[model samples]
Target: SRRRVVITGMGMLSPLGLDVPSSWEGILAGRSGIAPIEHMDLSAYSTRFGGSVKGFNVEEYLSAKEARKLDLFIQYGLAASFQAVRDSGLEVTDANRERIGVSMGSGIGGLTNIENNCRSLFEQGPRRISPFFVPGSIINMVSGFLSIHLGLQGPNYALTTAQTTGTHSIGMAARNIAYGEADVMVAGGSEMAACGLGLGGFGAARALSTRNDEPTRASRPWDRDRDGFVLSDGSGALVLEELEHARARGARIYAELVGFGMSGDAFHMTAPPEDGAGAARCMKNALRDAGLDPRQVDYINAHGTSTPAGDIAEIAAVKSVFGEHAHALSMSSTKSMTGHLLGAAGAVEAIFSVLALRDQVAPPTINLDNPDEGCDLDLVAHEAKPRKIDVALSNSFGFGGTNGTLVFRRFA
Candidate 1:
């Protein structure tokens, strides 16, 4: 028989907060993390504000020496993962080290590093580039660095599926454990792309919101005034363990990871199909994997990125998947508050979904003062709602038309 997987611990380093409790509290309070970009000058860009991590102290998580050798994305991942590992109370000794692994991902890994190094190459010659540039900035370095730090020697993996990176990483990690490939896995995603090219590239495509004057209200998903998604920097981590292993160790089970599904739109490079057919199939696949009916789901943390086409497409996908039962389900976009974390969005939102199930409350979709046409469901707009959420679903769709869904159920 196959093993079962459950979340034993979680960590968050988000634009909303530096850690889990603060981020969750911010979500419940309906506060916006999107604001004027503080990391660098944005005068040349039309979109001046974004969701940047505030008050991060590198010294608190990593030694000054180690911190200097890694990119901001890897640093964020390690910071969040340390919290997850510590919270899990999992001691990785020589005996059990081979049975533990790390799976982390990022869509645009170390874009800032790339930008900085390229500038050095142009201005100061190739010799001026930092020696740690490649090691610090690669996409898989998140998992590589985590495993090296934690002494996890099994199934180290990472993916770059745009916004679906986090969900895909967690899903694949669960599969590794469920198939008896490992007993424990640390999984999630991290992103740090708030720089000149990161902003200029997206701005040129008209992918970022231009609500520079009112930053907090910029990321208004599903609202008629919604312009575009606000880029964010953050990381989220989760500890997934085999049920028997966790039970034997008396680990606190947060929720059962019952379902994971993925699909490709195939129609467009950066835009979703108008009908959201791929997204519908992705959700249906997850529900089927969980052996669940439409009515069983109580809440959904939507992939509502505040983009006009993306937001409406997801609403259609939900309608298509849930059908008549869609009306009864409480669906909201924590992205409305956290802005969009890009690759890190799925993991952060997945953590939020688990919290919603545990706390028996659904977080509100902040700044939904004017819902657009066809968004008729109970969005839990403006404020948090207390509800018994037996099963919570989180959706994530990416720029490559890639999609992922994760289904979490209350630990029975």
Candidate 2:
């Protein structure tokens, strides 16, 4: 049997807030972070709104000279990981530094830099491009830079699975520890793709909410008025350590990572199966891995992205897996407030799921006014509800029909 893994610390930088505690406060208060795009000119795009990490200053985390060498996405990921490392209080000495690993991912890594560099190449010439372009913008650079930043020498890896990237990163990190490849892992995802190309591409595909007149209310998951998901940018980080190792260090355990499951839709590139077949199987697999029944799940941070098909599909999938227990479970979409953070969706939602278990309060699915036909379950709409949450699940499904689920339980 594999060893157990537990979350020792967490860090976050989202539109909701700059850190985990602030973000959790906004989540429990049912505050919406969606807003008009003020960082750039989006007049040419159909969607004019997004959830941006307001007032983020890289200088606070890294020196200005050091920050310029990396792209915005890398800066976000490295900064968040540093925060997590500090929170976990895991000092890396020569004796045990090799046993700490890093697993981080990004769906569209450094799209901002990639777009800008391509533009510069065509208009200004290749020589005008910065020398650090390739090293700064690649997806794997996040983990590489993080490993170098903290001297973590074990199992460094990165995955790019669209929106499911974050959850997959964390899940794989847990597996490494369970199999004795590492005693500690730094795992999460980050995204800073609120650039022109990022917005224009999703808008051209009609995958964004066009309710520019009402930005805050645009990402209303399960609401009858929701058109599509809102794009956002941020990073979420978590420190996963072996249970025994954490206990020996007298670490503050947040929650135990009991199970993780993933699946491929094998049907569409950017859309889910009509009846949520893949999603249902993913959830069932997680429960099987956890050795638990459906009734044991008290809360679920749903992957409800406010898209018409995605929300309904997730509802059908949950109903199929939970049966009558579905009605009793409190399922809410934090995306309703934070918008869709793309690659970082799963990591941030994982933090929220653990927080729900930690505080015994189910975060609200804000703006869930009118639920669709099958979405009539307990959504905990508009207000956070106090409840005894023993176990929680966070779901993330990405384009290319990728799906991921993470199971977190109250540490006994």
Candidate 3:
């Protein structure tokens, strides 16, 4: 039989907050983390606001010299990883070090760093590039650095699936433990893409909201006024451990990761079909893997990014998967408050899903004032609601027509 995996610890650094408690509190209180883009001049851009990490001091996690060698995404990833490891209280010794691993990633790893290096190459010369450029900015460096720091010697890798990066990373990590390749895995995603090239590229694609007049209300998912997603910077990590291993050490269980599913749209590069057939299939597959009926799911943390097409598509997918029971369940988009963290979105939403199960409360989708046509589900709009959430599903769809679903069950 395959081993069961459960979440023993979680850590997050979001535009909403520097850590889990602060971020969760902001989410539960319906606070918006989006604001004007102050880090860079947006005079040449159409979209002027985004969710950028505020007041984050890398010195708190690493020395000045050490921090200078890594990119901002890597720094965020390492800090979040350290928080998760400490939260899990997993001691590393010669006996158990080899049985632990790390799986962390970023969707657009080191875009800003690449931009700066290219500028250097053009303005000066190739020799002016930093020697640590590749090592500090690659996608797999998050996992590599974390493993090196923590002495985790098991399966060490990273997966990049755009916004689905975190969900896939966590799913693969769980699979690693279930297959007996490791007893524990630290897995999640981090992203720092609110820079010049990052902003310019997404803006040029018309993938970001231009609601510069009202930053807080910009990410109004499922609302009639919604335009596009708000880009954000953040990191989220989770420690997944085999049930028996956690039990032996008396670890505090948050929720059990019961199911994971993925699918490809195969229709478009960046858009899903209006019927959301691929997303529906992905959710159904996850339910099947968890051996659950449609009526058993109590909550869903939707992949609602405030885009016109994506928001409506996700609602259709939920209805198709749950049928009449869809109206009974609560579904909310924390992106309404935290905005979209891009590659880190799924991992942070998964953390919120676990917290929802722990507290039996459904966080609100702030700024969802007027629901759009066909958006008629119980969206828990405007305010948080207390509910009985035993089973929660988190959804994430990426730019490459990739979709991922994670199902978490309350630990009884």
Q: CA lDDT, every prediction?
A: 0.92, 0.92, 0.93
* Local error of candidate 1 at residue 306 (angstroms): 0.3
lDDT of candidate 3 over 2-116, digit per residue (tens): 8999999899999899999999999999999999989889989999999988999988888999899898999999989999999998898999988999999789998878888
Q: Roughly what TM-score does model 3 have, to 2 decimal places?
A: 0.99
Badly placed stretches (over 4 Å) of model 3 are: none
lDDT of 2 at 183: 96
Model 1: CA > 4 A from native: none
* lDDT per residue as tens, model 2, 1-412: 5999999989889988988999999998889899999989988899999899988889878888878878888988987898898999999999888899998899999999889899999999999998999999999888899898789999888989999999999998999999999999999999988999899999999999999999999999989989999998889899999999999999999999999999998989999987999999988998899999989999999998999999999999999999999999999999989999888999899999999999999999999888888788999999999998999999999989999999999997
Poorest lDDT segment (10 consecutive residues) of candidate 2:
60-69
- The candidates, ranked best first by lDDT, are 3, 1, 2
Error of 1 at 52 (Å): 0.9
The TM-scores, one per candidate, come to 0.99, 0.99, 0.99
Name the lDDT of candidate 3: 0.93
The CA lDDT at 286 in model 3 is 89
